[PDB]
DNA sequence: CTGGAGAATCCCGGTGCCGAGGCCGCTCAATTGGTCGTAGACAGCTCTAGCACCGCTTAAACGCACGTACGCGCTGTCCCCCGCGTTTTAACCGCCAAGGGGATTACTCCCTAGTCTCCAGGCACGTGTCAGATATATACATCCTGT
DNA sequence: ACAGGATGTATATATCTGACACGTGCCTGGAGACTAGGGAGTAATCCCCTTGGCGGTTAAAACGCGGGGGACAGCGCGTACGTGCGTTTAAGCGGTGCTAGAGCTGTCTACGACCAATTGAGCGGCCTCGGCACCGGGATTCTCCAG
């Protein structure tokens, strides 16, 4: 007999796991490729320090985690547990980013 | 280097959401997460490149990135 | 068809060279001034009311 | 009998330059003065802070250029840079 | 007895005071030395921004059939323009009020 | 044929071929259509008479919405031209209109040749010589005219 | 007699107060409130009338912005009546709590 | 004392109306007159510290403007 | 002839569908939108200034 | 052969350098003149803040049963104390993580 | 072969004074250095702004105390000004 | 609601390493001691404005009653998200190579600080006149209930 | 949906009025000319680290499938909030009076910038070992499903 957890238990387990660790969650090489692509629009043939790319990645992950906390608060306020783009838009509008 | 925004994968976004304490995630979240991240990176990188080209060098430095972040009211520690 | 589209729908003889400021239909000159001098501030298209400051010349 | 400085005269000349037949309230002039002082403070502080980053002791037109690019968004920045460059070229030529 | 004095603002084709800007820069304790073209550039930028806001405010005042610009007109001009709104996003204008808008949900139907 | 600016330049070229204004001509650079070489004749009734002025003009893809960069190639003596040939005109910096074409630009330049703008003294020496001494100013203009033939 | 259904006078009031620019709080109670709050920092301070006016301008602007944000929250919650939960959510999102 | 009640129910209602609120629940007046006094305390404390650094006994509009500017709430029209 | 007559004169690419109520000249709408949002709030033809309310959609 | 040099930090009974603070104030282009007690006061304040954060981080590390302080411990110490959290509310700590907390609604019951 | 200055030594001494038997990582030291630089910049800027406001040309201990009161909240500010006053008094007595 | 199976979590032990910690030049930055110009402390005069009070109007806050529209609870459904196994992809680590560009040092020269003189732009002070607010009698659009 | 009554609402006219735009004396700060020195522009050189490439492992991503839980629509009830009207109440305005303190001026002294000489403490480098991450194995625990 196969064993399956109820939907949500492993979700809570992995929330506990990722709220305890501190490693970077985005894959470094694709993040670097994305950074170079975006920077291509301002100055061609730019060179980047590895420390600079790491600083960018750290800042983005912190920003996205904060945004997701705000989104979760909005979703809970809407009396539901699933986050939808209207919640992200509400959070960004209240914070003054849109 | 075209169409690299898809490197920010669905499982990575879910891991970020879990660190944010999110239990269930709608299927449409990923696209505007990509969009928000893209907007944030353009905003930061524009200022970083401005600092770099004012310094008259072709290399973007972590110091320039820190300066750009501080200019947006989100100072970052641990990089000088 | 170009002449028909360029001609006013009131008389179908003369070029459309003026518009009514609040309702934005395009008509002739003497067609609208005759309507106004006859006191009929009245659109043949959308029936809207108008005054002395509600119309002006327009050139192609 | 203290002498206090403001930008009222210059704002008034600019207003009559743009809208030749439009006035301005006394309270609006105060807001324009506050706005001018605020933008001046922003740009000067950013330029000084840049000069400090680059281990420089002189604020020249380049720092003002870069500070405008950093502060003003998009098309405003583009036009402001264009105006500043034109003014500097005109001043140097004359 | 030396020569006819010409103001730097007139020399640069500007209405804002170049000399006053230079004095404020040197007295404001921003840097040890101040370049020659820095006050010219700063005065030009300030003049351009002032002209932009005044032009929009004059348009707004004309749209209300008034010939004098008031803080309400300034507020309307700033908040209706996206770039000026972004530049002055954390600025409160006294006696300026707010922009008239109502969410579509609240409207009757 | 790819871009609207390129197509606009194509009509500019064909109009300059079929009905050019008096004393003006132009052509693309062979390897770069964005580069425009133009020859302007000095207006009649002016000190610039007999002049054959070489011009270079550089466009981008956002033409006609923006005034291009226009530069004199031969040495020029005009109150409104910088020593390098930089050109400061109303339609070229302040009141550009997309309806304007290269023919209109050349005609406006020729108009400036007769009527220098005192509000843009790009060459201070030339402005001063025009302002208080027309005789030696036009002597200098004749010098640049005879110099432009080479 | 004549009777307006609820929501119409409210819409008229929204249109009216979004068009005018006067101070929406009575001056003397606000002045007394400011003096009362300031007295716990130092005794018998004095205030300029312009200072009190500046405080009132700032307070009304802040409250109006907060009410726009709380209206957005209430609409997001599929409601039209704002509630203190909405204010708390807006305050928490803006990082004031 | 007890001056917080000066911020009356109709005053709060018309502030909400300017903000764009259709209807207001009855528990909001107490919440908002607490929010207001928190904001006022934060601003007034900075204003008073400015004043006492200046060795003055009267709070000035310029001190209030500085206190607001210290919180990212720059105010135009008072100096 | 007719094509150029009824095509927007500044771009010469598409059709006239807008009027500038200050100078009452007719251009195509997106040229106008672009000159506004790029902040050249100036008439291409008669060099007149205009605001957000001086231009509107027209149908010819 | 004047006298044995006593550091100003030792005179003030502080571990932080007073001379370095004075040099940074004079070089930092904050004012043309700097008082004598200003570097002393600034050094004392910096020392007190550093001591507070270090004590909290050490307590956090001892809670986790480690003997070294890492950015995770620094982040925990900062985010747990309300005063420090307010002071550093707009600060990102590299390799800091987040406070482990889950909203009560999400928990099953 | 440029030399760069930091507060690593003093931070380590303070750590040894507080927790005599606790270590600190290299990366944590970087965070402490950034924190010290940040607080220094904040207090220095606030003190300079006070000096400019009062038309004063000298940054004394009074401006530093006022800036500390403005920045630090509540009980933290009370303790900070207490330590500052104690240190300046000891320095003047020495 | 009460028990077993299973998967996940916690605890203990050995081990290897590389990063924290102590030690040694030495060089530059901190210290010490005069010197002097001036910025700031301080006394004194003033007269501006903040505080206090009183009386009258009336605009606004207050309180009550009603009804109805919205908040909230309950229920059904179905579809969209989650848990999981398998396969595919490319991230990642390790190593190697070329060189572009960042990081120094020397030299000089031109640009900006500092000073003295002067004169004209801008500031305080008056003043009349027109933009705008107010009161009033309209024409007209908008809501509400009965049809 | 339609129409007429009632109520805000837009409109044109006349009139006060007080704030603004213009004019004037004057005064002090910006312009002009000059001198001096050092900030930085330029060139040259060194070597660091950044980019690019290749290959093997394998961890993570992608896909698919089954199921079930939660988002959403719908319905009913009750209560609380908007609306209107009658009754306080005190905000607001004016007028007057008092004096505390902001603000300015003039004196004078301690104090911070500047300089030159001295030395010791922090930086760079360079060992060295133990705190900790990791791999193995045993004990404990949470959750699910059958009972
Ligand atoms: Zn007709
Ligand atoms: Zn067009
Ligand atoms: Zn026109």
Q: Which of E73, E77, F59, D76 is nearest to I40 (CA)?
A: D76
Q: How far is the CA of B51 from the centre of ligand 2 (A)?
A: 38
Listed in sequence order, the residues at least 6 apart from E8 whose beta carbon sits closer than 8 Å to its beta carbon are D91, E18, E19, E22, E39, E40
Residue of chain D whose alpha carbon sits nearest to that of H74: D38
CA distances for I45 relative to E39, F96, F98, I49, angstroms: 36, 10, 9, 11
Spatial separation of the C-alpha atoms in residues D69 and D78, rounded to whole Å? 8
Q: Can you tell me the distance from the alpha carbon of C7 to that of C23, in angstroms, rounded to the nearest whole number?
A: 19
CA distance linking residue A84 with residue A98, whole number of Å: 17
Q: Which fold has domain A9-95?
A: Histone, subunit A (1.10.20)
- The one-character DSSP state at H5 is G
Q: Quote the minimal CA–CA distance from G25 to chain A in Å.
A: 25
- Find out whether G81 and G57 touch, Cβ atoms under 8 Å: no
- Beta strand J68-69 with K23-24: parallel, antiparallel or unpaired? parallel
Q: How far is B74 from chain A (nearest CA, A)?
A: 8
- The answer to whether J3 faces chain A, any CB pair under 8 Å, is no
Largest CA distance in chain A: 60
Residues F94, F80: Cα–Cα separation, whole Å? 14
**Distance from the Cα of residue F78 to its chain's centroid:** 11
Distance A68 CA to M136 C1' (A): 39
Distance CA E15, CA E32 (A): 27
Q: Are the C-beta atoms of residues E62 and E45 closer than 8 Å to each other? A: no
Asked if B75 lies within 8 A of J94 by C-beta distance, the reply is no
Token pair 């950074």 in the structure block, residue: A35
DSSP state of F43: P
Helix (H, G, I), strand (E, B) or coil at H55: coil
CATH annotation of H4-70: 1.10.20.10
38-67 in J: which are within 8 Å (CB) of K?
A: 38, 40-55, 57-58, 61-62, 67
Chain H residues in contact with G6 by the CB 8 A cut-off are: 23
Surface of H (28-47) touching G: CB under 8 A: 28, 31-32, 35-37, 39-41, 43-45, 47
Using CA coordinates, name the residue in chain D closest to F81.
D93
Q: In this structure, are residues G13 and G7 in contact, taking their beta carbons and an 8 Å threshold?
A: no
Q: Solved by what technique?
A: cryo-EM
Whether C40 contacts C27, CB under 8 Å: no
Q: Which residues of K touch E28 (CB under 8 A)?
A: 52
CA of F56 to the centre of ligand 2 (A): 28
Instruction: Find, among I20, I17, C15, C1, the residue nearest to I6 by Cα.
Output: I17
Spell out the alpha helix ranges (H) of chain K.
8-18, 26-53, 61-71, 74-93
Sketch out chain J's domains with CATH numbers: 8-106 (1.10.20.10)
Contact F116, F128 (CB under 8 A): no
CA–CA distance, H70 with I4 (Å, rounded to integer): 60
Catalytic residue among F13, F88, F91, F100: F88
Contact between E57 and E49 (Cβ < 8 Å): no
Q: Are J66 and K21 in contact (CB under 8 A)?
A: no
Tokens 């979004």 correspond to what residue? G18
Question: What backbone torsions phi and psi does residue F48 show, to the nearest 5 degrees?
Answer: -75, 10
Residues near F26 by Cβ (< 8 Å), separated by ≥ 6?
A: F12, F13, F16, F20, F36, F37, F38, F39, F55, F57, F102, F106
Domain boundaries, chain F: 1-150
Give long-range contacts, CB 8 A cutoff, 24+ apart: A26-32: A26/A57, A26/A60, A26/A61, A26/B8, A26/B12, A26/B16, A27/B7, A27/B9, A27/B12, A28/A53, A28/A57, A30/B4, A30/B7, A30/B8, A30/B9, A31/A56, A31/A57, A31/A60, A31/B7, A31/B8
Q: How far is CA D47 from CA D35, D75, E38, I50, in A?
A: 18, 20, 10, 35
What are the boundaries of each domain within chain K?
7-93
The nucleotide lying nearest E32 (C-alpha to C1') is L113
CA distances to H5, H28, H64, J105 from H33, rounded to whole Å, are 8, 8, 21, 29
Task: Give me the number of domains chain C comprises.
Answer: 1
Give residue I11's domain range.
1-60
Task: Give the Å distances, CA to CA, from C13 to C16, C18, C32, C38.
Answer: 10, 15, 14, 21
Report the CATH fold assignment for G8-94: Histone, subunit A (1.10.20)
The DSSP letter of residue I15 is B
Nearest to J97 by CA among A22, F44, I40: A22
Instruction: Answer for the pair K43, K84: CB distance below 8 angstroms, yes or no.
Output: no
Q: Which residues pair with D58 in a beta bridge?
A: E33
> Which DSSP category does B26 fall into?
-
| Count of CB pairs separated by less than 8 Å, F with I | 22
Cβ-based contacts of H66 with chain K (< 8 Å): 53
Other C-beta atoms lying within 10 Å of the C-beta of residue D8:
14
Q: What's the Cα-to-Cα distance from E72 to each of D15, E61, J3, rounded to whole Å?
A: 17, 9, 70
Determine the nucleotide nearest to B25 by Cα–C1' distance.
Answer: L81
Helix, strand or coil for residue J33?
strand
Strands (E), G1-97: 46-47, 81-82
Structure tokens at D57: 């002791």
Nearest to G72 by CA among D9, F114, D85, A94: A94
Peptide bond connecting F64 to the previous residue in cis, omega within 30 degrees of 0: yes
For A35, A95, C24, C29, C51, the CA distances from C43, given in Å and listed in that order, are 59, 49, 10, 14, 12
* Segment K88-92 long-range contacts (CB within 8 Å, at least 24 positions apart): K88/J12, K88/J37, K88/J40, K88/J41, K88/J44, K88/K61, K90/J11, K90/J12, K90/J13, K91/J8, K91/J11, K91/J12, K91/J37, K91/J40, K92/J37
If DSSP codes are grouped into helix, strand and coil, which group holds residue F25?
Answer: strand
As a residue count, chain H comes to 79
Beta-strand runs (E) in J14-86 = 33-34, 68-69
Q: Do chains C and I touch (3 or more CB pairs under 8 A)?
A: yes
**Range D74-80, long-range pairs (CB < 8 A, 24+ positions):** D74/E83, D75/E83, D75/I37, D75/I38, D75/I39, D76/E49, D76/E52, D76/E83, D76/E84, D76/E87, D76/I39, D79/E48, D79/I39, D80/E45, D80/E48, D80/E49
- CATH number for the region D7-93 comes to 1.10.20.10
F88 is catalytic: yes
C17: which 2 tokens?
């060279």
Mutate to test the interface with A, among J76, J98, J108 (most CBs of A within 10 A): J98
Give the integer Cα–Cα distance in Å for H9 and G75.
22
Per-residue burial over A8-34, b = 16 or more CB atoms within 10 Å of its CB, e = otherwise: eeebbeebeebbeebeebbeeebbbeb
Alpha-carbon torsion angle D85, D88, D91, D93, nearest 10: -70
Q: Are H78 and H62 in contact (CB under 8 A)?
A: yes
Q: Which residue of E has its CA nearest to I38?
A: E83
What superfamily in CATH does domain B5-72 come from?
Histone, subunit A (1.10.20.10)
Q: Which residue of F has its CA nearest to I27?
A: F99
Q: Could you state, in order of their start, the residue ranges of all structural domains in chain H?
A: 4-70
Q: What was the resolution (in A) of this experimentally determined structure? A: 3.1
Q: Rg of the Cα trace of chain K?
A: 16
Q: Which chains touch G (3 or more CB pairs under 8 A)?
A: A, E, H
């Amino acid at each position: 007999k196969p064993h399956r957890y109820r939907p949500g238990t492993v979700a809570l387990r992995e929330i506990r796991r990722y709220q305890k660790s501190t490693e970077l969650l985005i894959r470094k090489l694709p993040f670097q490729r994305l950074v170079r692509e975006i920077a291509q629009d301002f100055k061609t043939d730019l060179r980047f320090q590895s420390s600079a790319v790491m600083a960018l990645q750290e800042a983005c992950e912190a920003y996205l985690v904060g945004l997701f906390e705000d989104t979760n608060l909005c979703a809970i306020h809407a009396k539901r547990v699933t986050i939808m783009p209207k919640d992200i838009q509400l959070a960004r509008r209240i914070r003054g980013e849109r | 280097l075209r169409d690299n925004i898809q490197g920010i994968t669905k499982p990575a976004i879910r891991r970020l959401a879990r660190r944010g304490g999110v239990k269930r995630i709608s299927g449409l979240i990923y696209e505007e997460t990509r969009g928000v991240l893209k907007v944030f990176l353009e905003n930061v990188i524009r200022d970083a490149v401005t600092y770099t080209e004012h310094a008259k060098r072709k290399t973007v430095t972590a110091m320039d990135v820190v300066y750009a972040l501080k200019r947006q009211g989100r100072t970052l520690y641990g990089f000088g | 068809e170009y002449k028909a589209r360029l001609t006013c729908p009131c008389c179908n003889t003369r070029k459309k060279d003026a518009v009514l400021t609040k309702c934005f239909h395009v008509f002739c000159f003497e067609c609208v001034r005759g309507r106004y001098e006859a006191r009929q501030r009245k659109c043949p298209k959308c029936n809207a009311a108008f005054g002395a400051h509600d119309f002006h010349r327009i050139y192609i | 009998r203290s002498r206090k400085e403001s930008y009222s005269v210059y704002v008034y000349k600019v207003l009559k330059q743009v809208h030749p037949d439009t006035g301005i309230s006394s309270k609006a002039m105060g807001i324009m003065n506050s706005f001018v002082n605020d933008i001046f403070e922003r740009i000067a502080g950013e330029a000084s802070r840049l000069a400090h980053y680059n281990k420089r002791s002189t604020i020249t037109s380049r720092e003002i250029q870069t500070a405008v690019r950093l502060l003003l968004p998009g098309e405003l920045a583009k036009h402001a840079v264009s105006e500043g460059t034109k003014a500097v070229t005109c001043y140097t030529s004359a | 007895a030396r020569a006819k004095a010409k103001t730097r603002s007139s020399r640069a084709g500007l209405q804002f005071p170049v000399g006053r800007v230079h004095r404020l820069l040197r007295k404001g304790n921003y840097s040890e030395r101040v370049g020659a073209g820095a006050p010219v550039y700063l005065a030009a930028v300030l003049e351009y921004l002032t002209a932009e806001i005044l032009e929009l405010a004059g348009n707004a005042a004309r749209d209300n059939k008034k010939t004098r610009i008031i803080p309400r007109h300034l507020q309307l001009a700033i908040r209706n323009d996206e770039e000026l709104n972004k530049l002055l996003g954390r600025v409160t204008i006294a006696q300026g009020g707010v922009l008239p808008n109502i969410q579509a949900v609240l409207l009757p139907k | 044929m790819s871009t609207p600016a390129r197509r606009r330049l194509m009509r500019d070229f064909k109009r300059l071929q079929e009905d050019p204004p008096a004393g003006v001509s132009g052509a693309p650079s062979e390897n770069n259509i964005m580069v425009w070489n133009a020859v302007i004749f000095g207006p009649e009734g002016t000190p610039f008479e007999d002049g054959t002025f070489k011009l270079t003009i550089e466009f981008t893809e956002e033409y006609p919405n923006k005034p291009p960069t226009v530069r004199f190639v031969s040495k020029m003596f005009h109150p409104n031209v910088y020593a390098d040939g930089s050109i400061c005109l109303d339609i070229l910096q302040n009141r550009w209109s997309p309806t304007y074409d290269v023919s209109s630009i050349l005609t406006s330049i020729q108009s400036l040749l007769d009527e220098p703008n005192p509000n843009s003294p790009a060459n201070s020496q030339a402005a001063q010589l025009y302002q208080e001494n027309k005789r030696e100013y036009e002597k200098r203009v004749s010098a640049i005219v005879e110099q432009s033939w080479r």
